[PDB]
C-alpha cells in the first residue's frame, strides 16, 4: 500500500508555500463550506455538473418498502444464458422432445424484458411478468410465455 515517500508533499519541502500559492495562500474554507452558497457563488458550478440541483420532482411515497417493486430484469438479449453451456449446444441439436422450458423465476429475475432477437429455436419462458414485446419475438420463434408462480 502506502508511502508518503511517493507523496509530492515530501518533495515540496521547501518550496516555501508548498504548492499553495504565495499570493492567495490556501486558507481553511475560502469558498464557504460544502455546497454553500449553491444559490449564489456556486450557481455556475451546480447548473453545470449537477443540473437538476435544488427543487422538486414531488410525488412523496411514504413508506416505499422496496420489496413490492423490486422486480429485477433479464433482457431477451441474453435469456439463453440461463441455460447451462453444454446443454445450450445440446438443444441446438436439431432434436425435439420440446420446446425449451426455461424457469426464469428461480434464476431470480421477476420480469422478462423485451430487448429483441433470439434464434428461431422456440423458447417457452416461465416468468412472472411479461414484456409483451419479449413475448412477441418469442411467439415469432414459435415458443410461448407460460405465466408462472
Amino acid at each position: 500500500m502506502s508511502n508518503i515517500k511517493r507523496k509530492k508533499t515530501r518533495k515540496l519541502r521547501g518550496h516555501v508555500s508548498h504548492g499553495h500559492g504565495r499570493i492567495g495562500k490556501h486558507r481553511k474554507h475560502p469558498g464557504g463550506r460544502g455546497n454553500a452558497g449553491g444559490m449564489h457563488h456556486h450557481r455556475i458550478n451546480f447548473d453545470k455538473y449537477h443540473p437538476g440541483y435544488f427543487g422538486k420532482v414531488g410525488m412523496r411515497n411514504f413508506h416505499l418498502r422496496r420489496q413490492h417493486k423490486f422486480r429485477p430484469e433479464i433482457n431477451l438479449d441474453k435469456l439463453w444464458s440461463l441455460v447451462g453451456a453444454e446443454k445450450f449446444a445440446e438443444l441446438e441439436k436439431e432434436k425435439s422432445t420440446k420446446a425449451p422450458v426455461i424457469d426464469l423465476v428461480k434464476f431470480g429475475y421477476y420480469k422478462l424484458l423485451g430487448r429483441g432477437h433470439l434464434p428461431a429455436r422456440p423458447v417457452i419462458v416461465k416468468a412472472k411478468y411479461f414484456s409483451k414485446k419479449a413475448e412477441d419475438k418469442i411467439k415469432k420463434a414459435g415458443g410461448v410465455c407460460l405465466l408462472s408462480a
Binding site: 521547501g14 518550496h15 516555501v16 504565495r22
Partner: protein, 132 residues
C-alpha cells in the same frame, strides 16, 4: 607504486568551492550544507554578479571523469574479505575503502588480502596503531 585505473582525461573539478549556502558566513545556524534560495528578495536567485554560485548543472563533470579518484581508483565500500574479492577482476576501476566500523584484527586480514589481489586500498594506516 599502485598502477592507476584506465587512461582518464584530466579531472576538471569545475567549481571546486563548496556552494556553502547563502549567508553561512553570517550565521552558524545557517549550515554550510547547501539549501537553494527560493525567496522573493534573492539577489542570488536572480544571479547578480558577485552573489557566489548556485549549483547549476553546467559545473557538471564529464561522464568519463565521473567517480575517479585522481590516482584513478573509484570508491568501493569494503565491509570485509569476501567483499574485497569482488574487485579482484576490477583492479583497474575500483579501490577497496575499509569501512570505519571494521576492527583492526579483520583490517590486518583485509590489507593482507588486498596486497595479494593487488587492488589499491586508499587507507592502510587504517586503525594502525602502536596498539594491542
Amino acid at each position: 607504486m599502485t598502477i592507476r585505473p584506465a587512461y582518464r582525461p584530466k579531472i576538471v573539478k569545475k567549481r571546486t568551492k563548496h556552494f556553502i549556502r547563502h549567508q553561512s558566513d553570517r550565521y552558524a545556524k545557517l549550515s554550510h550544507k547547501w539549501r537553494k534560495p527560493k525567496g522573493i528578495d534573492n539577489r542570488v536567485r536572480r544571479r547578480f554578479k558577485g552573489q557566489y554560485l548556485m549549483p547549476n548543472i553546467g559545473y557538471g563533470s564529464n561522464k568519463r571523469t565521473r567517480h575517479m579518484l585522481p590516482t584513478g581508483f573509484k570508491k568501493f565500500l569494503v565491509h570485509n574479505v569476501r567483499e574485497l574479492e569482488v574487485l579482484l577482476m576490477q583492479n583497474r576501476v575500483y579501490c577497496g575503502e575499509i569501512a570505519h566500523g571494521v576492527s583492526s584484527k579483520k583490517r590486518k586480514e583485509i590489507v593482507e588480502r588486498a596486497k595479494q589481489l593487488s587492488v589499491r586500498l586508499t587507507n592502510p594506516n587504517g586503525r594502525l596503531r602502536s596498539q594491542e
